[PDB]
Amino acid sequence: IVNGEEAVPGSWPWQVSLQDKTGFHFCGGSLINENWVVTAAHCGVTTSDVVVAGEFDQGSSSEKIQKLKIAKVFKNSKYNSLTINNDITLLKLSTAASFSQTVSAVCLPSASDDFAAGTTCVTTGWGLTRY
Amino acid sequence: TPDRLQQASLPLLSNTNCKKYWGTKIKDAMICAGASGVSSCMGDSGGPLVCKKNGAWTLVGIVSWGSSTCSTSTPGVYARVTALVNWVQQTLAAN
């Protein structure tokens, strides 16, 4: 995020870090339940990548994070890589996340749900802070 | 990428107004947000765009794409979750 601010640790508990086997953070995701994570189809997740839940500071060896393995990747078959439309993938965990103060689910909207323009929402992540 | 988790507040835009920036690249399963002095950027993809509805945070967008330079004056594009929740529900149920 460019011009964001540091979050209070553990305050966005559904936020996970998608990392490769070397520990490199490449995308975010959200826990929607103990066994499933929603992320973008263009993230190109494979079952060799790791779901890291509970993390705040990626440079700390003393946080109690949860490194979870991925059982199966479900890329929405309507995802259109050319237009980046329907950019959604679901990840089924082989090891269920253990929900706690810092690890919990985000809510899903109803298909009929209304979020008006002008509404102030929040986005989180470990993406670039400057370009 | 920063070591610590960042956050930012940003407003939702209309697809119509989003089109003023992105034109026809803006499809229906997408929602824009930002152009407010903040921007999602490389490495934020796949993470959440949440809106509080009735006191609970709800997933409205999935960080998807936007400006190649993370321009804060251009809106970021998110996968529109209301357009995809049906698919999520079916998958979770069949698996």
């Binding site: 263009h42 993406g127 | 999602s40 490495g43 993809s45 998807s64 794409w65 936007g66 400006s67 970021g76």
Partner: peptide
């Protein structure tokens, strides 16, 4: 317009 780059992916993120």
């Amino acid at each position: 317009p780059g992916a993120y």
